[PDB]
């Protein structure tokens, strides 16, 4: 299986480690491996230092000075798998170091306080929370900076805006009124900005001349000079305009917060907020926000340049200073680390809220730790984040790729409340900046469009929540092997060129060059080229980047394909596509699917269970294998070993294959032999037909493991117990249970079988007065006990593979209150490809398997080789996805050559390469035929007739050469299986990669007769051996109503659910062989009479002539 | 649904509703006008 | 008087119909005071009640229709014979 | 009746009509560079140009199938009631014309390419803009399914 | 009032309001018995008003709390006659239904328009009562009890039983519905046809009416039980009778893709 | 822990009310009236057939207020309550 | 479609009338025995492993069949509703 | 038709000393092609047992 | 037997409210944990509303199907399934008048 690779653009730098977003976000979050000595703070340590100097001074007695030194974690409670087996979180313990001082002598320092537990991250990038693997998405929002907006309402001029956040961080808006009045909005407050400038220290003289020289608009500033004659008098003047009945003397009081400390700051000193100000305007920014503590009289870092630029924009050209919202340099991405640290900060301040109150009830000296510290608020906060937050979710780990794509997903809809389901128009739209930064394809179908979108393959978040796509500098017309990851805003400064631009080492070729100055598509010259694209993968996500002939595919069905790959199911006979993009290897690599040698070496031992190697440095290492493990959405993820005893190996070489990996290539489905023709109505509107042969050679067959669980809760009536001797059960039903009442391993279990025997006592509680005595009187413990066991639900199981008991004397387990033990039984099934299943190619051909033909009567080549699958051609013209056709063609050639290929995305394989390879193949599919003893079939001739008459072959030629022609065009003769006559027209066939999706027909087919019914509302449900009924919706009612279906509708609203007396009459009467007892009165009606009567309404029923009518069945009488 | 005259007791109301509502799913956001009418 | 569709509906003669709108208490009340009748005209009203659709089979035009074997048709002919006394 | 790649037939007249619109656009470019065309009229004239080039090649491929291969699977499906909008076919064989910006202003450069051969990286990214606006509209159709029909029923059930 | 999971009980919120009012009213009576200082009797009378207003309608006066923990307005009579379920609304907005099932659909070209194919097991469960009857008519079972035990598990099902099921089906029809039911042809009735496999099979012509294509799309299925329900079902509701749309007199069961391409 | 209210969001806090989720079992809830009817009568029959001191002791000590042997006796030895209690049961169960 | 349906819509003023007639016919067809019928003689409905729809599979089909003959009578208020059931139970046994 | 392995109790097992999971093995087993030389033989149980 | 063509809400005279009722709810006594049986004359009473139990009496006075329409002696119980119970209504005898807040607010 030799790989030819097509197209050579030398993609100069490899992909980022595609998990880096989570791993490094949660590295930067918690400086954990590094000493607290280490100089950078941001994340946990900064969230610490932010709150930490806790000054509760003088309202009676104080001198509390509790400060921060160090913090540490080190030791996780339990192993990872231990954290999953028992339902525990994978965490480290947090204890920071502290010293509270006094107004008097000395300072007690209690080293450690394990205030709160803090989860950890796995190598691969996920978390373990409730026992359950979870993942934190990222988030988008408006980056905290200085922005300039056209006046929404008024058509003319602009309004500034100073945006901070964390939420606590005040919002200021600086608009200039044609009236001249420079208005200024905080908390809905509108006033001449000047009052504020004065508070800073700006006198009306230096202001107008040195700022507003260039605009005459400066005269809109200086109007109220009457008030602006007095400095600190202004601070009070302003103090007025918040009016709770304040102390008008309290000087630096509100101005303290919007100066320095708690409110507008960005994370840390240097680049946190300063970049967004520094770039859009201004020059520098000492301090986090405009502030002063050392002199008391205040300095604005900010307020002058902001207004200066509102001038600079209102009048003429510094550059062109209107700011775009959706531009991804004026929008920001929230890594995991930061999100968790935001919650960690608000938790820490819940603690700082309680401890102030402990500064009051505190004795005098006796305070050192637990007086001040409880884990409770911080713990509750972090825990609340990880297990209840909108942005944590169950790991999408159907297959490796799925989980990977989840890890690098990106959401708009913030649990902080960033965006809501109502609005979406311009929000959802792709924006110029999403180039190289965000996938234009990866957004999902239906409501969630453009809100959740995954980031580009090459994109990577820098120190501050900004996406940065690379580019390579080019020098005059000389291209560099040097690469710069550029900011969105920074990107627009330059003239960037396309990667599909011709080369000669470092040199452009074409005088006409394709290139993009900010946004626009521009034709340009070689000299003018400042930067060039790295490769065309950078434009799209990872999924989207695994489609090989994407170039020829409408983005709409390309999205379908990208998303489809998410839901592929890992197949026992998994295969890596005959034709790949090349990323498959790196994807199984970066996902932690497989197992790779760490050094050169040799192999020592190879179990199904583990592998042991002997390295160069002297080491010998055991790697155990994930033998057969269950995944969040059912799919089996075992690792298989691929190496032998006494085989040498190379660093980075693979040792065992992941869930859906084939010799270390992403294997999501198979390569089947497709013919692409219509069939006797069996591949209709998208349906798909199959050769039974796929089942005999276990192809589209996948394992699946469900997992059942039951508790032995403890009761008012007495404790429940897990045992074999249930009462009213036939010996037959008990055969497969072990002595403890748990079903034994490797037994075949049918819906209705017992998995776990459990016996509860008779309910209605322990009747002390008479029975208590009876207990003494008669064989104490001779009471009564009913059976409440665990049955395989309708739906099914298969065979028991694994049991887990979590018993009392709980040896490392957090059992719920009341819970005595729990039992889980794991049940697997091999799921062959039944009819009703879903299959789809990479190019987005959703289809159902609709017919399984026996090998015998389905379309076969001249040589008796039949096709495996039969796709309707009618699926192609609508859904412009000619990629799959080119897959099929290349596949055809790869079948006879016995080789696989890599067509890089936009550096594809071109038409004639294809053709040459096909020629190569014809001399194998046919060259043999002639020597073997066999020329043409009379059928072959008879179809070549119609072929040249149709214009496919060129008349006058030998059938050999005609068949060559017909081959190269993608098509070959095909015989009907069932007639043996040929198909009157040649037909394209080839190898197609096609996969089996999560949507099998187990989760899907229900059918209710009769059963349970809910207690308040009497519409049915299910439990023991009964499904639940389908909802008959209002529209379904409308449907019936349009028709005359009066009775059918009544039934649907009566006998078939709700009306009890009626439905019972109905069943019994069916058993008789009677029609059905519809009438009497409807439930709803008598119930709405009495329910109406419960408020004092007299609702009475009348005859034709207005007369009384007893609706209540002769039961109304007193 | 036939081409003979309408049969008494046919719920023409609902039928007309449906028959106008269903194609609404094909109206670009068009529809706002159908509402505005 | 020309009205918007939602307004047109929202303001019906029937009360049962109106209790299917986010305003129920008011209308309940209103029609309680006035001893208001709901003739069961329309469908919505009739269906809130578990009653038989006033359209398809449910039309009084059709509800009542009878069928007879000739055998039993001449049988009712006998009923009016015996009615003559002595 | 299957679908090879070669069933998607690019007419000989494409490269022609392309040449034509290429230099004619160059004309409009001097004609604005001289001062005769206002910045606006330039734009509207480019748009005009491509609008026409597009319509032209569309009718041209249909002329091709009609005359040379009247049993061409693509064109068969298209002119039967099976499958096909000539607008689409235009995109497969001929060219998908001008993509618009998010805003509404159509792009200055159109998409010269067919699906049958390499859509370039950027033609693709320009394509996307409109594509997701379509998918979005459809999703905003789904959201409230019997909305209108609801109100109508409330008005009409009687 | 009920027993859920052991020593817990569960209560309709209305009973705590009714107890609130029994409490207040009784204390009032014995406040008149045990002598009558005005401000105290008033305070009680006011309490009384308050709690009537409670059980009738919370949150029109700031709302009663069950014991600070589940600080949620208790369900008042009014709340029952209005809400999400609200007695009035739910009867329309519609119920869960007994005789009903669901599966993925699959093209069933070798059906008639007349018909729909559906999976054996499904058919079995669906007409189960009827089937039991049939087993009783014939020597298959003595009475229903036996018939019942006969069918609970899958490997059992005897051939003659099947033949009886077929006998039950005869010329009855079932209704088929597809998700967003926009006009009345969103539901049509078909003659059921036992088929190998596990999904429902549909006649391609009325993939038009139900906007269904075979790529994961599911459909539900219901039985009609009465001779009446059946009559409407096949006379007005059967597919083969519903050929032209009522929207436009155009025919709706028309040739779609494959058929046309062929002809 | 008290009886919990019948209407609470279950699972995904969307629209579920905890009456939705619970089926029905049995109407008659039998073996109550008939059983008590036999029960208390037979119980009383043998209750009466032995010396009332012994019967009544843990008759009302175990079944008319609360739980005590320390406090059991009106006023005799702990030994004697123990004794006659046990022996009473014994003769009561199986008469010789 | 089902046997001779156009002929049956031709039989009535309202489509729905047909449904009501058929329904009620199948009803009495079951209730007062199954020998209610006007047509059995020779060649009426049938089924396939023995042959007997000549006893009791599908009742409404029987209705449509009878109705297809001018044998039955349908009409708004032919006969007083009570003496109807009296007469039906009195003439035909089978309970 | 059917296989049984000493210490295996179901097809989803793995044996010690053995690379192939019991599925890989039963798949490798389906490949077995075996002539009966006598058409009375409806079935045969082959035994494998090897070590080291 | 008689058809129902018209339905009418009126306001109800307290004498009608008593007419509707069977017995007056006395005690705020649901049911005792000991016996999941109706406490004295509490909200869930057997005499007032009807028997929780299928066909049986509260007092066990009558326990079979045979006397389907008859009423029991020491507690008043006319018998059927769950439905008779969900259908019968009681009443509270209010000391001081109180007001239907619908008419108020």
Coordinates of N, CA, C and O in Angstrom, one line a residue, chain F residues 9-86:
Chain F
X9 N -38.6 21.2 38.7 CA -37.9 20.8 37.5 C -37.0 19.6 37.8 O -36.1 19.7 38.7
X10 N -37.2 18.5 37.1 CA -36.3 17.3 37.2 C -35.3 17.3 36.1 O -35.5 17.8 35.0
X11 N -34.1 16.7 36.4 CA -33.1 16.5 35.4 C -32.5 17.8 34.8 O -32.1 18.7 35.6
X12 N -32.6 17.9 33.5 CA -32.4 19.2 32.9 C -33.6 20.1 33.3 O -34.7 19.9 32.9
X13 N -33.2 21.2 34.1 CA -34.2 22.1 34.6 C -34.9 22.9 33.4 O -34.6 24.1 33.2
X14 N -35.8 22.2 32.7 CA -36.5 22.9 31.6 C -38.0 23.0 31.9 O -38.5 24.0 32.3
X15 N -38.7 21.9 31.7 CA -40.2 21.9 31.8 C -40.8 20.7 32.6 O -42.0 20.7 32.7
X16 N -40.0 19.8 33.0 CA -40.5 18.6 33.7 C -41.0 18.9 35.1 O -40.3 19.6 35.9
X17 N -42.1 18.3 35.4 CA -42.7 18.4 36.8 C -42.7 16.9 37.4 O -43.1 16.0 36.7
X18 N -42.3 16.8 38.6 CA -41.9 15.5 39.1 C -43.1 14.5 39.3 O -43.0 13.4 39.8
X19 N -44.3 14.9 38.8 CA -45.4 14.0 38.6 C -45.4 13.3 37.3 O -45.9 12.2 37.2
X20 N -44.9 14.0 36.3 CA -44.5 13.4 35.0 C -43.8 12.1 35.1 O -44.2 11.1 34.5
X21 N -42.8 12.0 35.9 CA -41.9 10.9 35.9 C -42.3 9.6 36.7 O -41.6 8.6 36.6
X22 N -43.4 9.7 37.4 CA -43.8 8.6 38.3 C -45.1 7.8 37.8 O -46.1 8.4 37.7
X23 N -44.9 6.5 37.6 CA -46.1 5.7 37.1 C -47.1 5.3 38.2 O -47.0 5.8 39.3
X24 N -48.0 4.4 37.8 CA -48.9 3.9 38.8 C -48.8 2.4 39.0 O -48.4 1.6 38.1
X25 N -49.1 1.9 40.2 CA -48.8 0.5 40.6 C -50.1 -0.2 40.9 O -50.5 -1.1 40.1
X26 N -50.8 0.1 41.9 CA -51.9 -0.6 42.4 C -53.0 0.3 43.0 O -52.6 1.3 43.7
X27 N -54.2 0.1 42.7 CA -55.3 0.8 43.4 C -55.7 0.2 44.8 O -55.7 0.9 45.8
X28 N -56.1 -1.1 44.9 CA -56.7 -1.6 46.1 C -55.8 -1.4 47.4 O -56.4 -1.3 48.5
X29 N -54.5 -1.4 47.2 CA -53.6 -1.4 48.4 C -54.1 -2.4 49.5 O -54.2 -1.9 50.7
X30 N -54.4 -3.6 49.2 CA -55.1 -4.6 50.0 C -54.2 -5.1 51.2 O -53.1 -4.6 51.4
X31 N -54.7 -6.0 52.0 CA -54.0 -6.6 53.1 C -53.9 -5.6 54.2 O -53.1 -5.8 55.2
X32 N -54.7 -4.5 54.2 CA -54.6 -3.5 55.2 C -55.8 -3.7 56.2 O -55.5 -4.1 57.4
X33 N -57.0 -3.6 55.8 CA -58.2 -3.6 56.7 C -58.4 -5.0 57.2 O -58.7 -5.2 58.4
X34 N -58.4 -6.0 56.3 CA -58.6 -7.4 56.6 C -57.6 -7.9 57.6 O -57.9 -8.7 58.5
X35 N -56.4 -7.5 57.3 CA -55.2 -8.0 58.1 C -55.3 -7.4 59.5 O -55.2 -8.2 60.4
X36 N -55.5 -6.1 59.6 CA -55.6 -5.5 60.9 C -56.8 -6.1 61.7 O -56.7 -6.4 62.9
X37 N -57.8 -6.4 60.9 CA -59.1 -7.0 61.5 C -58.7 -8.3 62.1 O -59.1 -8.6 63.3
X38 N -58.0 -9.2 61.4 CA -57.6 -10.5 62.1 C -56.6 -10.2 63.2 O -56.7 -10.8 64.3
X39 N -55.7 -9.4 62.9 CA -54.4 -9.1 63.6 C -54.8 -8.8 65.0 O -54.5 -9.5 66.0
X40 N -55.4 -7.6 65.2 CA -55.6 -7.0 66.5 C -56.5 -7.9 67.4 O -56.3 -8.0 68.6
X41 N -57.4 -8.6 66.7 CA -58.3 -9.5 67.4 C -57.6 -10.7 68.0 O -57.8 -11.1 69.2
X42 N -56.8 -11.4 67.2 CA -56.1 -12.6 67.6 C -55.1 -12.2 68.7 O -54.9 -12.9 69.7
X43 N -54.3 -11.2 68.3 CA -53.4 -10.6 69.2 C -54.0 -10.3 70.6 O -53.4 -10.7 71.6
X44 N -55.2 -9.8 70.6 CA -55.9 -9.5 71.8 C -56.3 -10.8 72.5 O -56.4 -10.8 73.8
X45 N -56.7 -11.8 71.7 CA -57.1 -13.1 72.3 C -56.0 -13.7 73.1 O -56.2 -14.0 74.3
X46 N -54.9 -13.8 72.6 CA -53.7 -14.4 73.3 C -53.3 -13.4 74.4 O -52.8 -13.8 75.5
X47 N -53.4 -12.1 74.1 CA -53.1 -11.0 75.1 C -53.8 -11.2 76.4 O -53.3 -11.1 77.5
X48 N -55.1 -11.6 76.2 CA -56.0 -11.8 77.4 C -55.7 -13.2 78.0 O -55.9 -13.3 79.2
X49 N -55.3 -14.1 77.2 CA -55.2 -15.5 77.7 C -54.0 -15.7 78.7 O -54.0 -16.8 79.4
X50 N -53.1 -14.8 78.8 CA -52.1 -14.8 79.9 C -52.3 -13.6 80.9 O -52.8 -12.6 80.5
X51 N -51.8 -13.8 82.1 CA -51.8 -12.9 83.2 C -51.5 -11.4 82.7 O -50.5 -11.2 82.0
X52 N -52.5 -10.5 83.0 CA -52.4 -9.2 82.4 C -51.2 -8.4 82.8 O -50.8 -7.5 82.0
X53 N -50.6 -8.6 83.9 CA -49.3 -7.9 84.3 C -48.3 -8.1 83.1 O -47.9 -7.1 82.5
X54 N -48.1 -9.4 82.7 CA -47.0 -9.7 81.8 C -47.4 -9.2 80.4 O -46.5 -8.5 79.8
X55 N -48.6 -9.5 80.0 CA -49.0 -9.1 78.6 C -48.8 -7.6 78.6 O -48.1 -7.0 77.7
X56 N -49.6 -6.9 79.4 CA -49.8 -5.5 79.3 C -48.5 -4.7 79.3 O -48.3 -3.7 78.6
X57 N -47.5 -5.2 80.2 CA -46.2 -4.6 80.3 C -45.7 -4.1 78.9 O -45.7 -2.9 78.6
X58 N -45.2 -5.0 78.0 CA -44.7 -4.6 76.8 C -45.7 -4.5 75.7 O -45.4 -4.2 74.6
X59 N -47.0 -4.8 76.1 CA -48.1 -4.4 75.3 C -48.1 -2.9 75.0 O -48.1 -2.4 73.9
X60 N -48.0 -2.2 76.1 CA -48.1 -0.7 76.0 C -46.7 -0.1 76.0 O -46.5 1.0 75.5
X61 N -45.8 -0.8 76.7 CA -44.4 -0.3 76.6 C -43.8 -0.4 75.2 O -43.1 0.5 74.7
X62 N -44.3 -1.4 74.4 CA -43.8 -1.5 73.0 C -44.9 -1.0 72.0 O -44.5 -0.7 70.8
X63 N -46.1 -0.8 72.5 CA -47.2 -0.5 71.6 C -48.4 0.2 72.2 O -49.5 -0.2 72.2
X64 N -48.0 1.4 72.8 CA -49.0 2.4 73.1 C -48.4 3.8 73.4 O -49.1 4.8 73.4
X65 N -47.1 3.8 73.7 CA -46.3 5.1 73.6 C -45.0 4.8 72.8 O -45.0 5.1 71.6
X66 N -44.0 4.2 73.5 CA -42.7 4.5 73.1 C -41.7 3.3 73.5 O -41.8 2.8 74.6
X67 N -40.9 3.0 72.5 CA -40.0 1.9 72.6 C -40.5 0.6 73.2 O -40.2 0.4 74.4
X68 N -38.6 0.2 77.1 CA -37.4 0.4 78.0 C -37.5 -0.5 79.2 O -38.5 -0.6 79.8
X69 N -36.4 -1.3 79.4 CA -36.5 -2.3 80.4 C -36.0 -1.9 81.8 O -36.5 -2.3 82.8
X70 N -35.0 -1.0 81.8 CA -34.5 -0.2 82.9 C -35.7 0.5 83.6 O -35.9 0.4 84.8
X71 N -36.6 1.1 82.8 CA -37.8 1.7 83.3 C -39.1 0.9 83.2 O -40.2 1.4 83.5
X72 N -38.9 -0.4 82.9 CA -40.0 -1.2 82.4 C -41.0 -1.4 83.6 O -42.1 -0.9 83.6
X73 N -40.5 -2.2 84.5 CA -41.3 -2.5 85.7 C -41.9 -1.3 86.3 O -41.4 -0.2 86.3
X74 N -43.2 -1.4 86.6 CA -43.9 -0.6 87.6 C -42.9 -0.4 88.7 O -42.4 0.6 89.0
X75 N -42.5 -1.6 89.3 CA -41.7 -1.6 90.5 C -41.4 -3.0 90.9 O -41.9 -3.5 91.9
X76 N -40.5 -3.7 90.2 CA -39.9 -5.0 90.6 C -38.5 -5.0 90.0 O -38.0 -4.0 89.5
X77 N -37.8 -6.2 90.2 CA -36.5 -6.3 89.7 C -36.4 -6.3 88.1 O -37.3 -6.8 87.5
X78 N -35.3 -5.8 87.6 CA -35.0 -6.0 86.2 C -35.0 -7.4 85.8 O -35.4 -7.9 84.7
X79 N -34.5 -8.2 86.8 CA -34.5 -9.7 86.6 C -35.9 -10.2 86.4 O -36.1 -11.0 85.5
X80 N -36.9 -9.7 87.1 CA -38.2 -10.3 87.1 C -39.0 -9.9 85.8 O -39.8 -10.7 85.3
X81 N -38.7 -8.7 85.3 CA -39.3 -8.2 84.1 C -38.8 -9.1 83.0 O -39.5 -9.8 82.3
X82 N -37.4 -9.2 82.9 CA -36.7 -10.0 82.0 C -37.4 -11.4 82.0 O -37.9 -11.9 80.9
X83 N -37.4 -12.0 83.1 CA -37.9 -13.4 83.4 C -39.3 -13.6 82.8 O -39.4 -14.3 81.8
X84 N -40.2 -12.9 83.4 CA -41.6 -13.2 83.2 C -42.0 -12.8 81.8 O -42.9 -13.4 81.2
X85 N -41.3 -11.7 81.3 CA -41.4 -11.4 79.9 C -41.2 -12.6 79.0 O -42.1 -13.0 78.3
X86 N -39.9 -13.1 79.1 CA -39.5 -14.2 78.2 C -40.4 -15.4 78.4 O -41.0 -15.9 77.4

